[PDB]
Symmetry: C3
Subunit: 334 residues, 3 copies
Amino acid sequence: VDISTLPRVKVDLVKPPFVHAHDQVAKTGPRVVEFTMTIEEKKLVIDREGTEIHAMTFNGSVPGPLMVVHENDYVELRLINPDTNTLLHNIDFHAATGALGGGALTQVNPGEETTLRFKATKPGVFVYHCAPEGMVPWHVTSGMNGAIMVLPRDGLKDEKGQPLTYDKIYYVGEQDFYVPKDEAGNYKKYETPGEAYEDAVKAMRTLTPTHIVFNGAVGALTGDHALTAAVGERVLVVHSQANRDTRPHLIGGHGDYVWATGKFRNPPDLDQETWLIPGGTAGAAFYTFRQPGVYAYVNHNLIEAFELGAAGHFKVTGEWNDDLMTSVVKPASM
Amino acid sequence: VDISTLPRVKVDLVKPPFVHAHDQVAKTGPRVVEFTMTIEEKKLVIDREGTEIHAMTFNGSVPGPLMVVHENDYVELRLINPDTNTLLHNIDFHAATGALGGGALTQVNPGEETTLRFKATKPGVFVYHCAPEGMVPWHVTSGMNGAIMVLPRDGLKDEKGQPLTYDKIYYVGEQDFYVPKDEAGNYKKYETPGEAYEDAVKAMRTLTPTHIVFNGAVGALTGDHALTAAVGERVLVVHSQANRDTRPHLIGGHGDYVWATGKFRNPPDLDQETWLIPGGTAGAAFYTFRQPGVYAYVNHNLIEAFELGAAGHFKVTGEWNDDLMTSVVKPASM
Amino acid sequence: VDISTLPRVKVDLVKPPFVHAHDQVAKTGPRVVEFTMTIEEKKLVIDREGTEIHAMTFNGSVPGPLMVVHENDYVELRLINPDTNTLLHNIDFHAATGALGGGALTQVNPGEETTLRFKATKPGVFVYHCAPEGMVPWHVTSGMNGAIMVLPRDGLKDEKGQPLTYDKIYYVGEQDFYVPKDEAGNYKKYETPGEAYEDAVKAMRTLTPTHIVFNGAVGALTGDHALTAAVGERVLVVHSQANRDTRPHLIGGHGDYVWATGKFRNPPDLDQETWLIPGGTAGAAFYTFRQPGVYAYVNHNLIEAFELGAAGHFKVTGEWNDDLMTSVVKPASM
Ligand SMILES: [Cu+2]
Ligand SMILES: [Cu+2]
Ligand SMILES: [Cu+2]
Ligand SMILES: [Cu+2]
Ligand SMILES: [Cu+2]
Ligand SMILES: [Cu+2]
């Protein structure tokens, strides 16, 4: 087969929790979709008390952008490592076949550039992350991870076969930070990551994170930055994790359709309250709202949710329904 | 639809691991089932060495009672907070839709009372727990949790469709306690929970429990308080967890039918040895015994089972079967 | 039924990750397969820095050998405890029914021998381990565990029904060691296990392992001891765990067919990137390779993989495929 006959299309990626424009059903044969990502290292504030870390990011955000392609398309990515960085990076896709998911061919030193083309042969949601030889967990637990969705050429289907169309799509990436704290119980500071590597390893070896955040900060999805919807809309939430297990939960709602492993060739589950997403994988949930108000989106390890910071908010417009839930007797003195 | 035409029925709840009387198949249309729960705070001994904690409970037991209703019924709960308590409580159902599962409408200060009515629209086993704004994990990891079973209007079915009828039903609730210990390695004591909140938070932030118990105490289901059955009986064990993952295991037996997420609209699994129940969810297992004797029911994280206290016992009456298992040569010297 | 009419067959077990000779489809009725295992206690080096532990083993290896039988066969095991050991051991199968999986009938003091016969009535992969009264986690987290595969009498089938034949079969057993370290941060040494029991308990109570290894040592499956295959071959990897959850991942590949709980009466999953295997269970993955080169086989808790030592290697011979993955622009300066 000649690759030079398929059409080409350029896409510009958007900062999460929003996704770039796309169609839910394909209207073309296989194509060549062209993305562009610039690695960047920067200081990040990840809580209210002003805790600072040295994060490494794709396109300058934790997590990286969510790419969306169709099955049997050709994904061509152009990765740039500017001259102001200091480390060696390389991407690694869980959707590509062979050569360590592409990590053996995308090693770029500071001030370099590479291009990798692969074929998306399996539909579902997959995880991509950095993976340099000898520093994999340090690069991954600092923010170099993201997801990619390979939709089927015909669309999503329920357990029987009828199509499933969504109105909105959000992308939530959970991230666990292991910040090294000195003997007095205070977090430390450094100048460059090379001074932080040793303490980062020593803190990672304890297997317990210090922070767990949605979208790269505490409260990054609550307040004015909350997600939005209306009663009757259909939302697809793509949840991702790269190093640790997670159990998403939508307080007040359920999961109408859940791919907990994120593979669309399998029939989904029904009426899930809390599903488990293993570490190093992405899951998808499909929900249609039925009541207005504010919703919580948490990791139902309640200590990780309400003590470490893994919580977000939904705002849904609409009109109440006294048949589903009603307050018969308001709180009185007797 | 008029709610005032459906019949009403009052139910009195029973202390676990026993369940109140009910029918496995519905013989009426939708009804209104009326429960009553009184919150109560008390000192609990949770091990053999006499470790004391300040537990908060529904109806004065850890875990709370197990309610049983049918699909599309109307659950009306009347929650009372006596004047001798000191905190603010509110229930939160994972089976109700909207308003944070009912937590935004059931806040009762000490010496108050409220009534909440919702509609059980999805069959399966669900978790309910307390959830006050700012103290969710502290209230939940002290004993304010339980389960509720919404059976289908026609009964349980296997993976092909034939009905599944059980003879007995037991309810096991696993609970993890994070008891604060002082510098010498000894557990601390307090007078009221307000003095314990700070150390409780500091101990919870370590993500490792100090105790893990079945039915609210070490050895609460072993000895004379063990569960009972006979060879040929059919038992449904409803296992619950509210904060941490668990992996139940029946030593010597299996799981004939397992709903690991606890949703009956999904086909069960077959011949499970150890299934995983995520944190903040309830699962159901259906087993028919084939050999007499004593059985262990453990959390197959063996350190949590035999070092922290998550173990219980079954006593089964019947006659042995030399065909399944037999001792050919008893332990000899050669 | 008379047991004395079925044919008998002796099998000699092989050190992992290799399996003794067997057929994928049965060519006889039910038989009586005879195994032999000798318990042995020995000092093991489990890392590069020469950390020593006192391991207890079946047949002198961590993990124990993998037995393979067919459904409805009769497994007869003869367990020997030589006079040079010092503890009391007893095996415990998750595939047998009744009497604590066989632990109540196989207690052998040093210098003894026993024989146990049971019937394999459920197909799948199961875990067996030692379980003495009062020392279960200490005996299990020192290397006394393994797996057993009970194949169906007709062979493995995919989600629709077509047979699945494998060319090679490997067995990977993950093991977590809790080595006690003294106040200076150095691992301790002892003479006999009786001196190590107390510190072993105190270290186990922290719920965090110090080492996590494939096949009983760091780097035991990398280098010249890596697993081998060719492009187009079909491999069945049987992964086991006895105390802790694990999430296997094949970097560069996928899971074509996955039994994550390891029970063959259930339809497998498709196109898994990372599946979760609960603690105290065994799972099976079936993969056919499509690209040559070196593959990583890791626990995708990347801290446990690349910081504690849970990693192995595949070497696949064959010819590259520029259509699946290709390097369009090699790393350049621009
Ligand atoms: Cu990197
Ligand atoms: Cu990965
Ligand atoms: Cu409360
Ligand atoms: Cu909850
Ligand atoms: Cu032993
Ligand atoms: Cu076991």
